Design an enzyme around this catalytic site. Structure first.
Site, mmCIF file in Angstrom:
data_model
loop_
_atom_site.group_PDB
_atom_site.id
_atom_site.type_symbol
_atom_site.label_atom_id
_atom_site.label_comp_id
_atom_site.label_asym_id
_atom_site.label_seq_id
_atom_site.Cartn_x
_atom_site.Cartn_y
_atom_site.Cartn_z
ATOM 1 N N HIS B 41 0.815 -1.223 0.000
ATOM 2 C CA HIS B 41 0.000 0.000 0.000
ATOM 3 C C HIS B 41 0.857 1.286 0.000
ATOM 4 O O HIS B 41 0.288 2.364 -0.138
ATOM 5 C CB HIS B 41 -1.109 0.039 1.075
ATOM 6 C CG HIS B 41 -0.654 0.188 2.492
ATOM 7 N ND1 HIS B 41 -0.711 -0.872 3.379
ATOM 8 C CD2 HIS B 41 -0.215 1.286 3.152
ATOM 9 C CE1 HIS B 41 -0.264 -0.400 4.536
ATOM 10 N NE2 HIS B 41 0.036 0.897 4.451
ATOM 11 N N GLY B 143 2.097 5.754 9.660
ATOM 12 C CA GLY B 143 3.514 5.706 9.318
ATOM 13 C C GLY B 143 4.224 4.505 9.921
ATOM 14 O O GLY B 143 5.346 4.192 9.507
ATOM 15 N N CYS B 145 3.421 1.446 9.485
ATOM 16 C CA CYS B 145 3.325 0.365 8.517
ATOM 17 C C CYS B 145 4.692 -0.043 8.023
ATOM 18 O O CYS B 145 5.545 0.811 7.794
ATOM 19 C CB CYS B 145 2.385 0.762 7.379
ATOM 20 S SG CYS B 145 0.710 1.143 7.952
#
Ligand code: N0O
Ligand code: N0O
Lengths: 304, 304
Positions: B41, B143, B145
């Site tokens: 993503h 953030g 991730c």
């Protein structure tokens, strides 16, 4: 979101852990520059611990009796001295992995990370708080002595604790990195009882703000209180007195949530008087006191 | 003694954390050898997340659109591919700090450490468990991730989790290091509700053994039970069914304490039915289920 008991990344401190052996005793040391810091009780036999005279025991030791091992390599000891309850072993090689560091002496209620070690090797990392009775509630087995407590400010490690002992009650005692014990404890195998372990009120409040930031708001009530009225209830529940300094420290959390500190105090007052009634706050059934307002802000902002 | 929610030392994983940027999106990547692993993503705009077609979005991206930064140095991307929900960015430099590693897919109830990161930099480390509904209860901000979950066996890091998202309920979802989500979750900004979060029974029992090893024995009763009778009570309290495999796994803990597994099951049965009555076990007012029998043995033996 989500709120966890989080320790600082431990890599910077792992690069400093060494094994110190004197005679048949092996414990951990912290290698910073050309000095290895370790608990002075490394020079004792289990028989000496009952009533050790460290200055006398130290006369019998020379540079070559302290075996320092970093990884699988042996460091050469070129000097040794005792500073309070720590030994400083001057080695001939500066630690190439020495981070930027400071030695600080923390106040009760302050939190820090512990890198638990055995034979100079890291076993795990967890978050602690210096209790108001100057003990810590750690996880330390025989041989964990010399493991350190620390905080990190971007790239500078502030070493605040060195583990020395466990009291009969299962709680832990140790020194700052200048060898001075936190509390009235001595490095001797003798009857040492801790005082009252009170709750760190300002930390509970910081954790109540973390809960509101994370959606757990059930405990928020329609009441307010004063510092004096709150402190009457707090003393009854063995909670530390809350000061205007603590109210100030909580300022940024109060600002972020729109909940005045005294309103949060009244919510906490009702939690103390009425209990949790089988409910949880951030998945806990008791009031957590091992997050400072700084830890809450840090975790909720993502400081690296 | 003392029992703490302990994470593995994170240094080995810190040496692998990088920042991956694609367009205006920045997240974390794991640099192992000449490959950087990150959530796919990263190629999406917030507007794409509603219904992204990753294969179509990926056609629009080239090696030079993925900016990989390790420390303050930029890595050159020489290849990119999508494997399930992760992107593998082949860089021209093998990570000099690559530890010995494995990619494992854990089963629910298994615990692991999370090194929470932002912009490729470590923020903190905490201990998690893969819930039986395949979510984790982490501490993750926007953030985070690309932050990974891992276990360590002496010097080999087993990467088991990569963080991808937070569900509306505040719980977390992610993949193994081959990009396959744990559970039925998809990397899409859509209504995803988790199933029942049951308690990991075998872990509660392991933690009850840790408590007896650490002196908290108040909950030990005069009763015993059978797996079937225990499981009737356990299902009523949303506890996972206990199997003979779990009884076997607890064998070493049963041996160390002299308390048969079924006796510990009857103690737990009474805790469920009668409650804690304002008491604590290892300083907790609820039954902890995020220590496996292996974590308990490890912590109580001092594995490094
Ligand atoms: O407490 C000690 N070590 C330790 N560190 N963490 C936990 N324990 C420990 C584990 C099991 C049982 C008892 C203690 C040593 C042994 O006895 C003494 C006496 C004085 C000093 Cl300064 C140090 C020590
Ligand atoms: O959830 C996400 N990130 C994140 N990671 N930990 C916590 N959060 C987060 C923090 C605050 C609010 C909401 C989420 C991103 C944003 O929305 C999506 C949608 C799909 C995916 Cl695969 C990923 C994401």
């Amino acid at each position: 979101s989500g709120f966890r008991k989080m320790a600082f990344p431990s890599g910077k401190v792992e690069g400093c852990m060494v094994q110190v052996t004197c005679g048949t005793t092996t414990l951990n040391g912290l290698w910073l520059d050309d000095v290895v810091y370790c608990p002075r009780h490394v020079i004792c036999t289990s028989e000496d611990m009952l009533n050790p005279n460290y200055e006398d025991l130290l006369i019998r030791k020379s540079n070559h009796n302290f075996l320092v091992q970093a990884g699988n390599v042996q460091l050469r000891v070129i000097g040794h001295s005792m500073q309070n309850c720590v030994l400083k072993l001057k080695v001939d090689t500066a630690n190439p992995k020495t981070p930027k560091y400071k030695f600080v002496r923390i106040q009760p209620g302050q939190t820090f990370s512990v890198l638990a070690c055995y034979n100079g090797s890291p076993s795990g990392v967890y978050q602690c708080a210096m209790r108001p009775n100057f003990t810590i509630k750690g996880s330390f087995l025989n041989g964990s002595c010399g493991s350190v407590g620390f905080n990190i400010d971007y790239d500078c490690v502030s070493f605040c604790y060195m583990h020395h002992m466990e009291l009969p009650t299962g709680v832990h005692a140790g020194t700052d990195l200048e060898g001075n014990f936190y509390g009235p404890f001595v490095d001797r195998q003798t009857a040492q009882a801790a005082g009252t372990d009170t709750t760190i009120t300002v930390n509970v409040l910081a954790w109540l703000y973390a809960a509101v930031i994370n959606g757990d708001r059930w405990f928020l009530n329609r009441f307010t209180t004063t510092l004096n009225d709150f402190n009457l209830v707090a003393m009854k529940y063995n909670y530390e007195p809350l000061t205007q300094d603590h109210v100030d420290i909580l300022g940024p959390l109060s600002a972020q949530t729109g909940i005045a500190v005294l309103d949060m105090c009244a919510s906490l007052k009702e939690l103390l008087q009425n209990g949790m009634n089988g409910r949880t706050i951030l998945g806990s059934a008791l009031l957590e006191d091992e997050f400072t307002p700084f830890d809450v802000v840090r975790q909720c902002s993502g400081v690296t």
